[PDB]
Amino acid sequence: MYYGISQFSEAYNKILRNSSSHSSCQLVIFVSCLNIDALCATKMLSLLFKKQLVQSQIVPIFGYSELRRHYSQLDDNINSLLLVGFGGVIDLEAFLEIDPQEYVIDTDSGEQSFRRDIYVLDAHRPWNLDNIFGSQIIQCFDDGTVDDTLGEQKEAYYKLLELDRKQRKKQIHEYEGVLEEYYSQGTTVVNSISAQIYSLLSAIGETNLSNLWLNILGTTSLDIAYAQVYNRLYPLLQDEVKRLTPSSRNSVKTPDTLTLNIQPDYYLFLLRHSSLYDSFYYSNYVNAKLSLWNENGKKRLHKMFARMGIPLSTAQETWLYMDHSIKRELGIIFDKNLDRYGLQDIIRDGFVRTLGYRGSISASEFVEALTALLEVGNNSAQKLTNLRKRWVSNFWLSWDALDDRKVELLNRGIQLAQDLQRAIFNTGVAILEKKLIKHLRIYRLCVLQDGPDLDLYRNPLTLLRLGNWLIECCAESEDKQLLPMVLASIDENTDTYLVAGLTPRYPRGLDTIHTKKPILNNFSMAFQQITAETDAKVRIDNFESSIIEIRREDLSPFLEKLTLSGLL
Amino acid sequence: YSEWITQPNVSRTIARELKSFLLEYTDETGRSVYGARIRTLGEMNSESLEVNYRHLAESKAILALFLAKCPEEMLKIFDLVAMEATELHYPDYARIH
């Protein structure tokens, strides 16, 4: 372990001592864009440092190349660096060309001090042992995994470090085997950065309703792909909401009251900001459980609505103007008429925040709006950089959406979320009708070669959204065995693909012994190994490890070698 | 006849027979015609049940004769029966229509 849960306050105090000078701005926060959890964590840090008047700079970085370029550009005065959402799975001192002898001051006296401190803050579990164990400059905000599940790796790393006959060589190979089996592991996510920073705030005592709301947003960002993590962290948020809500309950509503509530939040898509029919129709879970992509699915949906006794005219009405008779009986109606179709998991408990008279909104809807703003908010090596520039710019739109004074931007985000879900649904029914997903014995490939609005999928977030749609659809099919999926999308302007190796997941709400063990995404190591040999102009720079940009002509040989690769 | 149909015992008998016809009539291919028709009716909030007269004549021809002779009350009885059958397939359909 490097920084446990109980000693986050030590890191915060170290940051304050090193860089809380009003003379200059010696603190720089590197945030990974295209990550809602990192966005909420950086918003928390921004508010916390605004309270203590610690001058700081927030830089959205898209890829590892940008991180390296910025660090090279980074001045030596800046003596505190925060990496939010990345950096925990690579040799940062090696990647950034860091040698501790050039950053050490006042070596003496069993202590050491350095002129610059890098605090990595992410949730991807393959901690690089040369970062968590063998470097003092790099300081990792651990969540308790290393101090409990890395004892063997700690011993193996230290023995090899200190040792630089037959028994000695045999034991070295035995220890080196322990390190090797630690690697060759898929990259998962166990915690949410927002929850970690909220734990730090609880240690410092700066918790309030806005920070709790940011924590809820960051945690709810994990419910789509890491539902086990969200279910693990949910009781803590539930306790915090009860702790922070004022005792003056059942009071009259006033234009100033902000209420965090735990009320039934059905697992539909933008239920409060769109019609009930559109909430069922465009839901990922409902689509998986009913197969609405085919023609018979719409008939099933209409039959369900008739069964509940909700007229289609009322069902398609906007949620605000739905008749108060139906809107107040949603719980009873869903209890009576959902287990018939297997949608019992739709009913759920979530967090809903109302700001005075501005109407309710749930964290699930809020994160969809934020994601939409990230995705569509606003010869070959140059236009791609223009895309990176636009993608960085969208981070600030999603950042400004968090402010309560910019609801006119959150509504635009909601509209963009509805449009993007519509486009995702159209492309999904186009893929599943033409049977574009080629089943294999290693990975179910799927390449998007032509169609409409194909420029949406050059963004990694939109491609992951489509992949999550497909994976949710496949997960509820019993015949289809679990298998990694690959999505690609040709970028005509740059003549390059965007391969996004995904991971399968068990059906939502299905809790078993094998469900408890998380599924690990093995595509990162496979991609890196394939790129190391057989130079193919592959661009592996995303913080999301399992996403690469490959030339149009080099895609097929790359996939051939990947098929020959048994790593994944 | 109108007086014959309006008798409460005769009305109850006719309603029961019509409900049995709707629930149990099957054609040559073996599938229940009116079960599927009621499913489609509720699915699209149709409000109208298309009942073939040939089916009503083939089975329980006396009811077909009554309908063709005094439709004013037979239609009311058969409308109530159709509502009951739809409520059987789609409970709480009275909220829609």
**Do residue A369 and residue A409 come from a single domain?**
yes
**Is A380 among the domain residues?**
yes
Best residue in A277, A308, A323 for a mutation probing chain B (most B CBs within 10 Å): A308
| Nearest chain A residue (CA) to B96 | A311
Question: Total structural domains in chain A?
Answer: 3
**Do residue A366 and residue A333 come from a single domain?**
no
**Is A242 among the domain residues?**
yes
**Is A478 among the domain residues?**
yes
**Do residue A240 and residue A314 come from a single domain?**
no
> By the CB < 8 Å criterion, does B96 face chain A?
yes
Tokens found for residue A374: 């990230």
Distance from CA of A301 to the nearest CA of B (A): 9
Q: Do A306 and B45 touch (CB under 8 A)?
A: yes
CB pairs under 8 A between A and B: 29
Q: How many residues does chain B have?
A: 97
Q: What's the CA gap between A285 and A224, in Å, rounded?
A: 10
**Is A350 among the domain residues?**
no
Task: Find all residues with CB under 8 Å of B6, minimum gap 6, and list them.
Answer: B73
Structural domain boundaries in chain B: 8-97
**Do residue A119 and residue A226 come from a single domain?**
yes
**Do residue A120 and residue A90 come from a single domain?**
yes
Tokens found for residue A219: 């945690």
φ and ψ of A501, to 5 deg? -65, 120
Distance from CA of A404 to the nearest CA of B (A): 40
Q: How many residues does chain A have?
A: 568
Q: What's the CA gap between A58 and A65, in Å, rounded?
A: 17
Please name the CATH architecture into which domain B8-97 falls.
2-Layer Sandwich (3.30)
**32-51 of B, contacting A, C-beta below 8 A:** 39, 42-45
Q: Do A306 and B95 touch (CB under 8 A)?
A: no
**Do residue A206 and residue A334 come from a single domain?**
no
Say which experimental method was used: cryo-EM
In DSSP terms, which residues pair with A73 in a beta bridge? Answer: none
The data reach a resolution, in angstroms, of 3.1
Which three-class secondary structure state does DSSP give residue A501? strand
φ and ψ of A350, to 5 deg? -140, -175
Residues B77, B11 contacting (CB under 8 angstroms)? yes
**Is A19 among the domain residues?**
yes
Q: What's the CA gap between A229 and A227, in Å, rounded?
A: 5
- Render A58-93 in DSSP notation, one character per residue: EEEE-BHHHHHHHHHH--SS--EEEEES--SSS-HH
DSSP state of A257: -
CB contact burial A478-516 (16+ within 10 A = b; e otherwise): eeeeeebbbbbbbbeebebbbbbbbbbbbebeeeeeeee
Longest pairwise C-alpha distance within chain B = 39
In DSSP terms, which residues pair with B26 in a beta bridge? Answer: B32
Q: A392, A319, A348, A548: which is closest to A35 by C-alpha?
A: A392
Residues A193, A37 contacting (CB under 8 angstroms)? yes
**Do residue A331 and residue A414 come from a single domain?**
no
Q: A387, A468, A382, A380: which is closest to A420 by C-alpha?
A: A468
Query: Where in A270-409 does DSSP place strands (E)?
Result: 349-355, 360-362
**Do residue A296 and residue A439 come from a single domain?**
no
φ and ψ of A525, to 5 deg? -65, -40
Task: Find all residues with CB under 8 Å of B25, minimum gap 6, and list them.
Answer: B32, B33, B34, B55, B59
Q: Do A309 and B39 touch (CB under 8 A)?
A: no
**Do residue A152 and residue A194 come from a single domain?**
yes
**Is A261 among the domain residues?**
no
**Do residue A339 and residue A368 come from a single domain?**
no
| DSSP H or E segment with residue A549 | strand A548-551
User: Domain range for residue A322?
Assistant: 273-343
